[PDB]
Structures are given as C-alpha cells and as structure tokens.
Design an enzyme around this catalytic site. Structure first.
Site, PDB file in Angstrom:
ATOM      1  CG  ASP A  99      -2.168  -0.860   0.967  1.00 33.78           C
ATOM      2  OD1 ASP A  99      -2.731  -0.815  -0.151  1.00 33.78           O
ATOM      3  OD2 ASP A  99      -2.559  -1.590   1.901  1.00 33.78           O
ATOM      4  CG  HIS A 141      -1.698   5.964   8.821  1.00 31.46           C
ATOM      5  ND1 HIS A 141      -2.323   5.681  10.018  1.00 31.46           N
ATOM      6  CD2 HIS A 141      -2.686   6.103   7.905  1.00 31.46           C
ATOM      7  CE1 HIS A 141      -3.634   5.671   9.839  1.00 31.46           C
ATOM      8  NE2 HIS A 141      -3.881   5.925   8.565  1.00 31.46           N
ATOM      9  CG  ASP A 177      -8.248   9.890   8.879  1.00 34.35           C
ATOM     10  OD1 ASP A 177      -8.471   8.666   8.855  1.00 34.35           O
ATOM     11  OD2 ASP A 177      -7.898  10.557   7.878  1.00 34.35           O
ATOM     12  CG  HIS A 179      -8.145   4.888   8.773  1.00 28.10           C
ATOM     13  ND1 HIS A 179      -8.642   5.599   7.703  1.00 28.10           N
ATOM     14  CD2 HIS A 179      -8.399   3.583   8.511  1.00 28.10           C
ATOM     15  CE1 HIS A 179      -9.148   4.759   6.815  1.00 28.10           C
ATOM     16  NE2 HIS A 179      -9.009   3.527   7.279  1.00 28.10           N
ATOM     17  CG  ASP A 270     -10.873   8.839   6.119  1.00 30.71           C
ATOM     18  OD1 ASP A 270     -10.916   9.737   6.989  1.00 30.71           O
ATOM     19  OD2 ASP A 270      -9.867   8.114   5.946  1.00 30.71           O
ATOM     20  CE1 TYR A 314      -7.742   7.505   0.519  1.00 29.48           C
ATOM     21  CE2 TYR A 314      -9.222   7.511   2.416  1.00 29.48           C
ATOM     22  CZ  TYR A 314      -7.936   7.492   1.883  1.00 29.48           C
ATOM     23  OH  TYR A 314      -6.826   7.475   2.707  1.00 29.48           O
TER      24      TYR A 314
END
Ligand SMILES: COc1ccc(C(=O)NO)cc1NC(=O)Cc1ccccc1
Ligand SMILES: [K+]
Ligand SMILES: [K+]
Ligand SMILES: [Zn+2]
Length: 401
Positions: A99, A141, A177, A179, A270, A314
């Site tokens: 990724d 990240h 986010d 995540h 997201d 996205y």
C-alpha cells in the site's frame, strides 16, 4: 489572518500520486470558485538552502537510512528497468511496498507535504497567522523508519516538533480521521508536552488496528508521557449528532486541563457518509450539523493558535465540499466576518465533477458504550493532570460530561 498553503509547484506535486490523484486541485479550485482566496493569506511551502539542511529537517523525526531509501525509490522509478532483488529487499525493510508503492515523484510528493506543514507552523509561531490550513498535509500513519497507509513522511510529527520546540509550551493534537492516528501517537508516546487525541473506527482486522483495547486495557503513553495519549474508538454507523456528543465534552475538558499553546487538527474526510469506506455517517451540512464543522467551531472558540490539516478522503468532490465549508467557517470564526456560500456549486474548471445535481451539501439523507468511555477518559485526564502537577477544578470538568 487565516493562512492557507498553496503554490503552483506545490499543487503539481500534491496532484502527482496514484492514490490521491487530482484531489488537491479540486479542493483548492472549489475554495477559489467560492471567492474565499481573497480572504486568506497564502503561506508558501518551506524550501531549504541545501540538501544537508533538507535532511536535517526531515531527520528530526525519520531515520537517515529511511530517507535515503525513499529517495532511492523515486530514482529507481524514474528509470526503465525493474528493481533488483537486493533493492526489493531494501524497500521491503522499510515497508516501501504494497500500500506504499513507488512512483516517479514519490519523494518530491511526500516531501512537499512536509514543506507545507513546516511553513504553516512557522506562520503560527511568528504570529503572522492565527490559524493556518494545509489541505496537502495530514499524513498521520508514517513512522520513524516505516511507510504506512500511503503515508511516507509524517508532516504532522515534524510540524508539531517545530511548535513544541519554539519555546512551558504544550500542544494538543486532535485527529478526526476515520483511522487511528497511530504514527503521531507513537512519536509522542513518552512526551507529556504533546497530548494526542484520536477519534476513529476500530474493529477486528480494520486498519491499522491500534487506538483500542489492548480484561484487556487501554495503553495511554509511557514514562513521563503516561496518560498523555487519548483514544475514542467508535462503532460503525455513527451519525453527526452522536459523534458530536461523543467528542464534544472530551475536547472541552482537554482544553481546560491542558491549556494548550497550539492546537493541531487532522481533518481527514473519510468519515463522510459518502466516502467509499461507508463506515461512519457524518455530513458537511451547515444549517443536522456536520460533526466536522461542530468540532472545528468548538476548537476555534478557544482562541488558541491552530493548525488545520487534511488527511484521508476518497470521494474527491465530497472531500472538496467538506473542506471548502471548513475553510469558510475558519474565516468566519477567526475574523468575525460573515461568509455566505451559495448552496449551488459555482461554475469553474472542475464544475463537471459535481454532477449530477451540482449542490454543496453531500448527497445523503439521514450510547452506554460511549458513557463508559467518557468515565475512562475523564479518569485518565485526572491521572494526567496529577502526574504533571497541573491545576484545574474536577467540578467544572466532570460536569462537562
Ligand atoms: C491500508 O488501507 C488504508 C490505509 C490508510 C487509509 C487512510 O485513509 N488512513 O488515514 C486508507 C486505507 N484504505 C483505502 O484506501 C481503501 C480504499 C479506498 C478507496 C478506494 C480503494 C481502496
Ligand atoms: K482519527
Ligand atoms: K504524548
Ligand atoms: Zn483515513
């Protein structure tokens, strides 16, 4: 003023990745089409006097060998032949794969986000701006020597390091986010001066896996940084109102107790109901009130110098729809000057991308667990303030929840 990072080269680099494509151009062109650019001060990305100065800045967090590998990955992708077996092993050792693949601009693209977010922190420190926005940044990240989740360089960590070292100085980091903000949390795991707070989805097998139960317990920092890393994991399907009520009291209590010198906000889009993840049900609505705009408004009401960054997102037109409204709200809250945005998308370069209806609202039609987390988080905040010998009245804070 309210500052925003853009530039011709900066735009080209931010639009050069295979995963995020031309998203940044849509965002800035929707902002421009709504006549917001005259209200904002352009903050230019940072550039350096030499390769050695560039490395000195980036290796404030990342390892020299990781930066070397990322730059070599760019060079190898600008040639015709395939990687050698030894070079594949090298890239694998830094998770530059799967990724986080190579592409011809992978180093310049990644570096650009650092350039913008460092420039934004500098604009806050010298007081040129009260708030600065960087919709090209927010890559939470990336680790010291590892790429993760299409994040190659952690612009957030480097921006925060610049703020805490400008001095006692304390930074509150808020991660909105979908995540878990694992890379930022990890970088400051042992640091009490940077308090991190991430709200996110977590569930078995869902990326990146942290920010939740580890009867298992919640890890929350270590050393002198014990109790300084906060998390609120949430079940799928949450709407604007329940998400707002979940994080609202935590935010107010963190500001009262921490009294931060700067706030850094990651505003990954997201969580929108229309994101292809389809996990949370937040909107960009502004009369239901968008959880995102609720949180930004609350944070800005504190009148603390603030950095607002991007992140995930996205559904590119709906991400532009949300970030345009965050931008308008920042101008209004900071300057006290009303921003009127038409419910219909104005004509501009990318108008066709907002079909078939061409409206500013996204196209969407809309707790015992959370009470338990609030008790846990309030006790952690108490332990944090005790350990760090900080003043506050348990009453004003307890009654927030
Ligand atoms: C490992 O996967 C990720 C790691 C990090 C993030 C992130 O947004 N982090 O904050 C997101 C993903 N997942 C995807 O992109 C899934 C996807 C979405 C749209 C189209 C194709 C695939
Ligand atoms: K988050
Ligand atoms: K910390
Ligand atoms: Zn995300």
């Amino acid at each position: 003023s309210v500052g925003i990072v853009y530039g011709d080269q900066y735009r080209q680099l931010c639009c050069s990745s295979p995963k995020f494509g031309d998203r940044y151009a849509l965002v800035m062109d929707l902002i421009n089409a709504y006549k917001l650019i005259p209200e904002l001060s352009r903050v230019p990305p940072l550039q350096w006097d030499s390769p050695s100065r560039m490395y000195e800045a980036v290796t404030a967090f990342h390892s020299t060998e990781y930066v070397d590998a990322l730059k070599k990955l760019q060079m190898l992708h600008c040639e015709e032949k395939e990687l050698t077996a030894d070079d594949e092993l090298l890239m694998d050792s830094f998770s530059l794969n799967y990724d986080c693949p190579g592409f011809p601009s992978v180093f310049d693209y990644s570096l650009a986000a650092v350039q913008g977010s460092l420039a934004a922190a500098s604009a806050l420190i010298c007081r040129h701006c009260e708030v600065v926005i960087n919709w090209g940044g927010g890559w939470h990240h990336a680790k010291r020597s590892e790429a993760s989740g299409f994040c190659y360089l952690n612009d957030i960590v480097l921006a925060i390091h610049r703020l805490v070292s400008s001095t006692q100085t304390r930074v509150l980091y808020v991660d909105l986010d979908l995540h878990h903000g694992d890379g930022v949390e990890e970088a400051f795991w042992y640091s009490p001066r940077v308090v991190t707070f991430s709200v996110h989805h977590a569930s078995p097998g869902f990326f990146p896996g942290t920010g939740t139960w580890n009867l298992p317990i919640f890890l929350n920092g270590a050393g002198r940084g014990r109790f300084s890393a906060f998390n609120l994991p949430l079940e799928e399907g949450i709407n604007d109102l329940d998400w707002s009520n979940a994080i609202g009291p935590i935010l107010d209590s963190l500001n009262i107790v921490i009294q931060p010198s700067y706030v850094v906000v990651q505003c990954g889009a997201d969580c929108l109901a229309t994101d292809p993840h389809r996990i949370f049900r937040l909107t960009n609505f502004y009369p239901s009130l968008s959880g995102y705009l609720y949180a930004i408004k609350k944070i800005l009401s504190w009148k603390v110098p603030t950095l607002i960054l991007g992140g995930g997102g996205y559904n590119f037109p709906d991400t532009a729809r949300l970030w345009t409204r965050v931008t308008a709200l920042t101008i209004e809250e900071v300057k006290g000057k009303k921003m009127t945005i038409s419910p219909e998308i104005p004509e501009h370069s990318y108008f066709s991308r907002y079909g078939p209806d061409f409206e500013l609202d996204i196209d969407y039609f809309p707790l015992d667990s959370i009470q338990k987390h609030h008790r846990r988080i309030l006790e952690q905040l108490r332990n944090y303030a005790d350990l760090n010998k900080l003043i506050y009245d348990y009453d004003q804070v307890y009654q927030l929840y």
